[PDB]
């Protein structure tokens, strides 16, 4: 494709980016005629919408209202920085009077870069907050260390692990934060028990609604990612290999639908290994036969 933008349409794009930064953070709505002459704008539109959805997802979490407000200000301040960019939106002056960066495709490319970097920046910010939220869950449930779980009976340990799973599973970013928290803590007896608790939840949870299947798929796929390149966790996978095969075929039953299932699995991964796809669509399908 090619991108052409008229002088007045660039002004319209600038205001639409401003409007998506403040208050309700609504979808950037632009005329289709304008989008057609420059399909790059779909990418920019989708990126700002993703950050808005991610911020809204933070609200329906146990995060401090101060924390969410502080993140909303950072997002708005950073979009305002893009809006004030003379390289993107304002007329060339002085030295760059007839530089090539004044052409539309170059202005829009720099807009793509700054919005992509904004998305990465906000992503790193929310990742830290999901780290904190995950840690708070372990602390509130009094299972943040080997010492805290040492004196739990088997029945109590099972009960704590179930409660933990019901809190981690509803938001995969919280689940990822829990794995990062356990990794940094380096408390292996706790990792051992959390692995057992994840498996038990995956083996028994209800799957009646789409929300439950989505929650379970993210947990299953990223539990497998968690074992990659880790001897202790790979050893845990090895011993419970057959149970994970049963779990994989429950979430991904249409074995003959290899291509669609693989695309679904890779879209939920946060490692880059083939291992989750291989377990679910290859190993488990071969063992059942």
Swiss-Prot record:
UniProt note: phenotype after gene disruption: RNAi-mediated knockdown results in prolonged intradermal probing prior blood engorgement when mosquitoes are fed on human host. No significant effects on probing and feeding time when mosquitoes are fed on membrane-covered heparinized blood.
Compartments in which it is found: Secreted
GO cellular component: extracellular region
Superkingdom of the organism of origin: Eukaryota
Disulfide pattern: 3-38, 225-271
Residues with glycosylation annotation: 144, 151
PTM summary: Proteolytically cleaved by human mast cell tryptase and chymase.
Tissue localization of expression: Female salivary gland (at protein level). Female saliva (at protein level).
Chief location: secreted
Keywords: Allergen, Disulfide bond, Glycoprotein, Secreted, Signal
Miscellaneous: Antibodies against the protein are found in the serum of individuals exposed to Aedes albopictus bites.
Entry function: Salivary protein that promotes mosquito blood feeding on the vertebrate host by inducing morphological changes in the mosquito labrum. Interacts with the mosquito labrum end tip and triggers salivation and probing. Modulates enzymatic activities of human tryptase and chymase.
Complex formation: Monomer in solution. Interacts (via the N-terminal domain) with cuticular protein Cp19 (via the C-terminus).
Protein name: Labrum-interacting protein from saliva LIPS-2
């Amino acid at each position: 494709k090619s991108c052409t933008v008229s002088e007045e349409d660039l002004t319209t794009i600038r205001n639409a980016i401003q409007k998506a930064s403040r208050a309700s953070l609504d979808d950037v709505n632009l005329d289709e005629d304008l989008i057609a002459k420059c399909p790059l704008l779909k990418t920019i539109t989708a990126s700002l919408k993703s950050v808005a959805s991610e911020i809204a997802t933070l609200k329906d979490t146990g995060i401090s209202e101060e924390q969410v407000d502080e993140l909303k200000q950072s997002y708005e301040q950073q979009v305002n920085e893009i809006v004030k960019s003379r390289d993107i939106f304002e007329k060339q002056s002085g030295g760059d009077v007839m530089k090539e960066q004044g052409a539309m495709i170059n202005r829009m490319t720099e807009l793509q870069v700054q919005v992509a970097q904004l998305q990465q920046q906000i992503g790193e910010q929310t990742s830290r907050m999901y780290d904190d939220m995950a840690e708070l869950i372990f602390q509130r449930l009094a299972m943040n260390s080997t010492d805290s779980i040492r004196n739990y009976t088997a029945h109590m340990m099972e009960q704590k692990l179930h409660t933990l799973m019901t809190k981690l599973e509803t938001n995969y970013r919280i689940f990822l934060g829990a794995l990062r928290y356990l990794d940094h803590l380096g408390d292996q007896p706790l990792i051992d028990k959390v692995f057992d608790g994840i498996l038990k939840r995956l083996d028994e949870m209800s799957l009646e609604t789409n929300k439950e299947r989505e929650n379970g798929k993210y947990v299953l796929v990223n539990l497998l990612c968690w074992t990659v390149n880790n001897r202790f966790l790979t050893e845990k996978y090895r011993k419970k290999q057959l149970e994970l095969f049963r779990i994989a075929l429950k979430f991904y039953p249409k074995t003959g639908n290899k291509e669609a299932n693989e695309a679904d699995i890779r879209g939920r991964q946060f490692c880059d290994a083939n291992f989750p796809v291989n377990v679910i669509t290859w190993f488990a399908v071969s063992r059942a036969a």
